[PDB]
Every structure is written in structure tokens, then in C-alpha cells.
Structure 1
Amino acid sequence: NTVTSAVKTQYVEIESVDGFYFNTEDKFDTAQIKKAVLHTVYNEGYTGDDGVAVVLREYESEPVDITAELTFGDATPANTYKAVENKFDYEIPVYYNNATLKDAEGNDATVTVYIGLKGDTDLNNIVDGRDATATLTYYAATSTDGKDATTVALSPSTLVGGNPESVYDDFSAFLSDVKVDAGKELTRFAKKAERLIDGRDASSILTFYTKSSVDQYKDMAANEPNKLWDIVTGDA
């Protein structure tokens, strides 16, 4: 007879953007999460003497902005990355108070990330001379009158398929930009057109490839490529 209210279900709606990462990175960036609103649905009603539940009304409380409270839990680029042919995107669950959330359709709410090997211009999970050539070739094309980042594709990958405006070409640019003059101030969210992909990027990459191919650096390239990148870019 006594009427009460209780949460019936709870879901989040999230506005997020893509994020690009290297396989060696230890942290996803929560800046991908632009806005997250938590909805809580209530039922109000009673249980009759016959033990049957009666619902008198259904409603939500005021939705709550929880954008700032969302984390990616324990997931990291390094522990998520798997080399798979023609496949670079991952759905990373968000966490709120150390638990996943459901989206409006009952599925765990996730954010899209792309993770690859630095230097891997052609997106084949291998860093080699072909990547250096592709990077050089893109520089030469975009250095020609009448051509730029908008009309030239960088990656030979079928995922780009010659399409200058593919998101995978932005991802390829991120992977190829091994020499960034601006440093950390040019963020991972820069688009291909916002980067400088030049012969210096191409010659690093080639040198990474050559050093990886001799006894001295074979293991460094395979185990901690980041230490080899620093050597080849003059940063260490």
C-alpha cells in the first residue's frame, strides 16, 4: 500500500572525439570526452497485498553532467594494442566511480581510440623502409605547386585508399610525424593538414629501420622502440 520510488535504470550519453595513440603510451587522454550526461530513471509505486508490484509512474531525475568524473580505468594504449591486419580502432569503456556505465541502448559506454606503431605510415604493423618512402613521397607531392594535405593522401594503406580526407590518413600522419618541432604543444588531436610531414620525418624512420636491422639495435627497436626513436631524432 505504501508508495515508494526507486531507480529502475541508469544510463549515460556521451559526446566524445577520436584519439590517436602510440602502442608505447601509458595513458589515454580524457580530453576525448567532451560531455557526459547521466540519466536516472525512477519508478514510483507499491506492492499490493497479493505481492504483485504496481507501477504508478515513470520519470527521470534531473540529468547530471559527469564529464569530469569519467576515467578509462586501468586500460592504456600499451595494454590494449594488438597488431591486427587493417584494424586499428578500439572501443575503450569509460568508468565512473570505478564501474562501467551503459549508454542509452544498454551497451557499455565506450570511447573510440586508434593505436599504432610510431613510424608505421602504411598501417601494416611494420616499421620499415616503405614507410620512409611513403612519407618522403607525400612531402614531395605536397611541395609541388597545386598540391597540399587536402589533395594528397599520405598512407598507401587500403584503409585510406588514396582518400586525402580519410581519418586513417590523419592517423597515418600522426604515426609518421616522428620529428615534431613544436614538441608536446602540437597535441595528438592535430589533423594531417596541421602537421609538417617532411624529409626529416622520412629520414628518421629510415634510420629507425636501418638501426632496427643491425645487431646493436634489433632488440631496442622491438622492445622499447621509443628509446630508438629518441636516438634517431637526436633527442637522446
Structure 2
Amino acid sequence: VTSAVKTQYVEIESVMGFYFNTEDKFDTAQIKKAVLHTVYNEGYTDDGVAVVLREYESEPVDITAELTFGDATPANTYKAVENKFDYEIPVYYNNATLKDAEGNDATVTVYIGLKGDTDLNNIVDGRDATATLTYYAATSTDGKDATTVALSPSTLVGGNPESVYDDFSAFLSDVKVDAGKELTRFAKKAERLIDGRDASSILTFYTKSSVDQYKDMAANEPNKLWDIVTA
């Protein structure tokens, strides 16, 4: 007499990750820990439906290292949308998705944008360079304190220098790399040196992108043009 059932879900522990739209892989380092829980619901078939009188939790198991992002890449996930830069990327275990404890597919949060887009409007232009200059001036006159200065005039930041969107803008805006600690995509705004070389580099990239000889490169291989600019 009816009935016995199991399924399984995942508790996932992860951090956000910043990416350029040109990048070909997401970083699984975003996944700090994942554990597959397995429940055993039992009871009886009901009138149209199911009733659960018991549930037996089998020993859960760490699968942090078995998790992948399947075929998703920043380049194939990026979609230009006004005031929207976040994506929930599904994880895959044994080549299939997993439900979380709320019955939704397990995902990790990423943010994806255009290098040089300080103001998060999906266009790299002179206004990104002048924003970056404003930040240069403000941090040149406060003891290099990033916590009282909002870099991006984006409404997603809204004047909050601690917003995740300001860290992201800083990641996008730090186009000229600086001597010192070798930074990863996981750096905080405060760790980056964003200064008049970044501002000038963004202005030069924009100006070059506007002229005929560079249009093909700007559209198709913008990293090559950034490299020309920053040398």
C-alpha cells in the first residue's frame, strides 16, 4: 500500500563575480561550497494527490568540485539591457541542473559589462572618461578613501560608494593596470587604483572607436583596441 518517494536538492554557498562581455569562461571559484541533500518522503497515495507522513534525511555530501556552468559563457550570456547587469547562471552536476531548497534551479550570480563603461549605460564614451576623472579628483583629495566616493553616476549606484554596482564599475573602469598587488576579477573598488591614466585611456579608446580605421576592431575585437591604447 502506497507510497515511497525521494528527490534531492542542493545548499549552495557562492560569491558574486564580475566579467567583461568578451570573456569565454565563468570562474568556478565563485562556488565556495555545495552540498547535495537527499530526502526520503513516504506515506500514501491520496485522492488525486500525495500525502507525506515521514521524511528520512540521508547523509548529505559535498559536491563543490563536481559543479560546472555547462555551456554558459560571459560572451554568450551578455545582453545589453538598460539598468540590468546581473545574471543567474545555472550550475550543473552530472551534466544536469539541480533544484535549490526553494525548488528553483541552483544558480550563481554574475555581473557582465563592457570594459570602460563607468556609468553603466552599455556605451563606452567620453562621459565614462569624465566620470572616471571626477573619481580621480575626489580620491586625490580625500586620502585615497574609496568609501566616501561614488565612482559611477549610474542609478544602480545612486550615490552609494559601497554598492556592488560601484565595485563592478570600478572593475570595468580600471582599464590601465597598475604596479602592485596583481588584482583578480574579485577585487574590491578600494583595492584598485583608478586615476587620470584610466580616464585618459577610456577617452582615447572612445575617440579611436569613432574613426573609420578602427570601427571593425572596436565592434569585433575591442580588447585589441584596449591593448593598443594601454600598451
Alpha-carbon spacing, 1:156–1:45, altered in 2? closer, same or farther (3 Å): closer
Residue 15 of structure 2 corresponds to residue 17 of structure 1: yes
TM-score by length of 2: 0.92
CA distance in 2, matches of 1:4, 1:42: 14
Q: Once structures 1 and 2 are overlaid, which stretch shifts more, 198-207 or 54-63?
A: 54-63
Return the offset for 1:137. Answer: 1.0
Runs of 4+ in structure 1 displaced over 6 angstroms?
A: 3-6, 49-56
How many pairs are equivalent?
A: 231
Residue 141 of structure 1 aligns to a residue in which SS? Answer: helix
Structure 2 unaligned residues grouped into runs of 5+ = none
Name the CA shift for 1:160/1:57 in 2 (closer, same or farther; >3 Å): closer
Match of 2:102, SS state, is: coil
Task: Name the SS for the 1:111 alignment partner.
Answer: strand
The structure-2 alpha-carbon separation of the partners of 1:56 and 1:162, relative to structure 1 and needing over 3 Å to count, comes to closer
Q: Closer, same or farther in 2 for the Cα pair 1:232/1:143, shift >3 Å?
A: same
Structure 2 CA distance for partners of 1:182 and 1:14, relative to 1, 3 Å? farther
Post-superposition CA distance 1:49-71 (Å, at most 9, x none): 99999977420110100011111
Runs of 5+ unmatched residues, structure 1: none
Shift of 1:145: 3.6
| Structure 2 partner of 1:188 | 185
Deviations 1:202-228 (A, max 9, x none): 111111001001111112111111111
Q: Residue 205 and residue 54 in structure 1: after superposition, are their counterparts in 2 closer, same or farther (change >3 A)?
A: closer
Report if the CA contact (8 A) 1:5-1:42 is conserved.
no
Structure 2 vs 1, CA of residues 121 and 56 (structure 1 numbering), >3 Å: closer, same or farther? Answer: closer
TM-score by length of 1: 0.90
1:20-59: CA deviation from partner (whole Å, max 9, x where unpaired): 0000000001111111110011246799x99999977420
Structure 1 position 185, deviation (Å): 3.1
Indicate the SS of the match to 1:4: coil
Q: Equivalent of 1:161, from 158, 161, 166?
A: 158
Return the alpha-carbon distance in structure 1 between the equivalents of residues 42 and 206 of structure 2. Answer: 66
Contact 1:7 1:40 in 2 (8 A): no
Q: Alpha-carbon deviation of 1:111?
A: 0.5
Aligned residues of 1:73 and 1:95 also touching (Cα < 8 A) = yes
- Which of structures 1 and 2 has the bigger CA Rg? 1
Change (3 A) 1:183 1:41: farther
